[PDB]
Amino acid sequence: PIATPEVYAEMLGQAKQNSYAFPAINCTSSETVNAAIKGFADAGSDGIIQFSTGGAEFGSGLGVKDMVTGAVALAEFTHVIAAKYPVNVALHTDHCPKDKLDSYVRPLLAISAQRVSKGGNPLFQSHMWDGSAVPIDENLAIAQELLKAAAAAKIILEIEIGVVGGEEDGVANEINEKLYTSPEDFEKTIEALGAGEHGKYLLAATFGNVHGVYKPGNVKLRPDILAQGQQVAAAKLGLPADAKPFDFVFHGGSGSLKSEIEEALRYGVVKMNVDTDTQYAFTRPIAGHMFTNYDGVLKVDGEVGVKKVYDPRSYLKKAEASMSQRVVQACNDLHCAGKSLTHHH
Amino acid sequence: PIATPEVYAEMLGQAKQNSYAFPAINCTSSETVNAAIKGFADAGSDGIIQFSTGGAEFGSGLGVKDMVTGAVALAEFTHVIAAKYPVNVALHTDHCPKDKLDSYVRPLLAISAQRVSKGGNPLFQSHMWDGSAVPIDENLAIAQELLKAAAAAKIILEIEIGVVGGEEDGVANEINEKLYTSPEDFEKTIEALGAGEHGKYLLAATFGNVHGVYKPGNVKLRPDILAQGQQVAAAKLGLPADAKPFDFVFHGGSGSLKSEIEEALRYGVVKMNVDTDTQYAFTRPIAGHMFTNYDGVLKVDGEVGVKKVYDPRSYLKKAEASMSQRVVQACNDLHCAGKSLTHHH
């Protein structure tokens, strides 16, 4: 089923308590949603499906190119599908910067507020505010009012401090020192938003994260930044030094070393975003299909091709199954496999 | 917008009166739905999006494989998208034989009946009963009760007399004399169902039709069968000899000669089904993408590929645009281009 807000909060609490995390898989289509949910199910795991601004625009089609339309359409599709799987599936929106709030997160929030006002549940269970490109104080000012709106709609807010390196859509962030979150940013976050009691939130605190897949080991993660952020917050809050007040989000998950994932889990990461690796998994058998069936997918030497192999289902089923396998791998990497809160086992 | 039942009836009436038809494009996904609707819009045309049994199964994902789930999920997706286009889009289900009625058309009918009972409109605007594999009397007995249910849910029923040749999913129909509908079958149809006054229906009367794309000219259509069927019916009904009591459906549209389409339009074809040609149009740029970007979509010689080209959106946008072009061609072949009943022009 789709995660209710209550089940989603239980999911994250269980993950936190037991030092595991859920994959948050970027999807762009019916096929990619289907692949993600089947991956969760095959792994006996709960999970999160997320739409980026570009993914939502793509989902709306070339004749529309509207983020709200694409996200709503894909969300409605997902609600129907997820009802037929035993595992819990949460819907999320990825990086939304300041100039897209009015055309993505805010109208989506308003849609969910309306549903809640009628006694229903929100369409999405979490939304990301990415204010990493503006100064920390402005980031958190926007975060505070968005958190009030989100909590009122039974929605968890994800926020970001520090910058994720690499290319996300047309835009590149330089890989530098800004990829490492400062102690003061950790402190200001707690001051501004508390530790859950003013609305539940997730913190994408960056520790060297880079979107994309580079040669293994080229991206230099420093998970210790997270351990120190937890210590900083526990001190502010008057908690024991081993308390973990933050629920962390691991961006740029694809291409990470297994040891880096394992370490991050020890410091309170409850969500790891995966996009690039599942994109490769989806595309890889499509490529193979076109090459091995080149004379069926192309009308060559006066022949008319072979429908059996140019039927989009023929290669897209292969794409789906391959992406699902990669999602199973993510569930085993993050230790959420076999832990679905439905215990359908 | 999605066609209301009243707008759909107006569409078909206009097409009939003016000797044009709408394309009915088989879709299987968010991308193919988006491509079809954009094609209609680019052509300034209304149109029909249809899901086959296999298309619906595919739409539900490999972990579900349920026709009702896939059709409902894709339908809900389509309702969101179609609201953002000026043209009218009707939703339809394709070939449903006797052994799949209880797991496809009937439960879908029941869903729409429920919506109508609450003062709403049906989820789908038409459904196909394909009883061509059973004797004509059984075919029409089932048709009569389905027509009552359909009319009660504000849904048009499509039925089939005669067999369409070729392969549709795993199953092949032999290309023979059964592809040509008999006069008695035309007569029994009118006796059983009337001419609209017991429920609105479309008639897929076969005249040599074959699913798929063979070398141009290999498939031998006999559109005169349709002209004679109209004459047969007008005689039964006591109408002038030039009356056209049937609304005909042209199956196996892909690969047809332009002259064959033109002739069929003169005898009351109001709907032509297209699947194979739009499948080729969708796949063709995907094939080209994989070949020209072979070293980006594959991790070769120890390199890690190129995300920009293995991102599924990169080739699927090309697929969408190419399929939309083929749909524009169908609208111009069927003379519905520039005739949308929204007159947004």
Add this chain to the structure above:
Amino acid sequence: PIATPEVYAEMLGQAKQNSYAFPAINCTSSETVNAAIKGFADAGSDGIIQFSTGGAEFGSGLGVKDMVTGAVALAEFTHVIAAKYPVNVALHTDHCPKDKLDSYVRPLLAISAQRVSKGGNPLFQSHMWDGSAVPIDENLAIAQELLKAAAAAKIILEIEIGVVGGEEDGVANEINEKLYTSPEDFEKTIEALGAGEHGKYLLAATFGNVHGVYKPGNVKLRPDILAQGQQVAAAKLGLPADAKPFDFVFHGGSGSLKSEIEEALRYGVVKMNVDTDTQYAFTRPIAGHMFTNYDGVLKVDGEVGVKKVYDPRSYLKKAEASMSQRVVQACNDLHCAGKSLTHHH
């Protein structure tokens, strides 16, 4: 065996007498030579293997790029191979313009003169002088002295009047009226060189010929130009009006209509050049090989490929066999199949 000058003259005499012609296949390598000779043998036919200036440069390798070296190396290779086939194989050099005479045809002539002086036979059995880019009088002045040298070395000279359209190497000739040979050019040729008694020669008189392969029918051949050239010459020589004093060469053979070849044969064509079509035949199975074995010819996803399919012999044997089939087709198109003067049958 390699055609001796006496056997080559007999070949051409037989072809002329019986209204058939030999294919002259452009080759560039051991594999293409092997493919051509096997094609001749499979067709029970004699034939001609020819090297263009660019083909000879290619044959010499990227470290040498010397036309004489490449032609000699490929010729020596061919002498060894041809000895093992029952059919007669003549060696020829293709288009040599004025600025390449001193670095191609002349030094090759000198090599053969040396062999003949020692009591041997020439290395090549014919050479082409292409003076179509200079005025007719200069063309024939050069032709006359080259003919003396060639005859002294037991070599037949091919000359060209009129221009062949299209691209031959880096250089394009415009497709225009210059592609059609003038009566005066026919007359000047006979005046300058006679009709065999001052040295045996072949005449590439152009009649709309274009190098390359365009859509069937786009190239407009006028074989009547040849019939009139024969009439013009028979008049000058005081022969009956149905005499055929010229041995014609049909350039741009690839992509020609079968009816065009048949007509040209009636007017004394004894040699038709084929390059573009045999290039496509050679390459086509190589393309197929790479696509169907994509994961064997490329080291993908950390694997090391599959030697069985990246071994150049695996696809080059397929290339050879396919090119040989196209050469068999040329022998059947030109009616030389089953007519080898060895009568090994």
Add this chain to the structure above:
Amino acid sequence: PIATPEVYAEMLGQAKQNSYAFPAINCTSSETVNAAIKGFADAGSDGIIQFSTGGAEFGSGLGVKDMVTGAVALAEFTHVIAAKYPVNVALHTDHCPKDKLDSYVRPLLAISAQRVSKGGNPLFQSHMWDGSAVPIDENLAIAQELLKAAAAAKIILEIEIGVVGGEEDGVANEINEKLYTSPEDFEKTIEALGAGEHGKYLLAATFGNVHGVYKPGNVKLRPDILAQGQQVAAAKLGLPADAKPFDFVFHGGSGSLKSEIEEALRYGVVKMNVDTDTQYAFTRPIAGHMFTNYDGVLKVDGEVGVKKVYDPRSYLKKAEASMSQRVVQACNDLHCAGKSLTHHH
């Protein structure tokens, strides 16, 4: 130039004295010969071109399939080409087992004996007798008489003790303990043939060698076997313990670790055979060419392709250049680069 027997002996003496070796590159064609020689030249190095039984059969063409014909044809081609390069190129034949002696090495020896009898030099400068599949005593009995014939024709004999693992043509040798040469085999070799004074020879003593390319490190070489073989022989001959009486040949060179090559050079390897790696280098840009030019090398959607890219020279020039680069790498790996005995520098 082609290496005279005197220059070839000088080459090997220089390599031995200075602890370097020459690559022996398997070739199958004009293009592969050209690529190999250009590689030697680019590296300022002498080198060896070798034809296997299968390579020679391939070189003779599908209509002939005769090892002697193919080897002679390719050798004659090579003599013309090599004259135009400043470096010395030696011609060799690879693995010839007992059942192919009468149809490969023996007739080739007879051809060279004839040339020498007329005051000329041999066609090939070395030939390989591979008797590893028969007992050591039979191997060396055949070796002794072949050595007499070879020396009389100014030809060096290569022999093999121990088995090379892997697939060489249709035949596979199991990767086991037989891949490691025994001390007694080293001793019997010296007893039978001496140390050069009864005819010059090269010794392919196996030390774990495997034909082909497996994942780096999977093939376990033991170069110490060679050091001990040298010690064994120096003892038999009454030489100092650091003497190197054997000239060793390193089979299965492709895919070897650089450290393994470096070690082998210290123990008297003067020749390393490379085939599989140069095959991959030749094929790799051909694959890339077909993919990136897929719509030019195939006639698609009713188009006629693009001659510029289906011309075999277009991709074979790329193949040549890539194989030459790999040969340059071999010259730098074996430390013969910059050491050509022509000192053209």
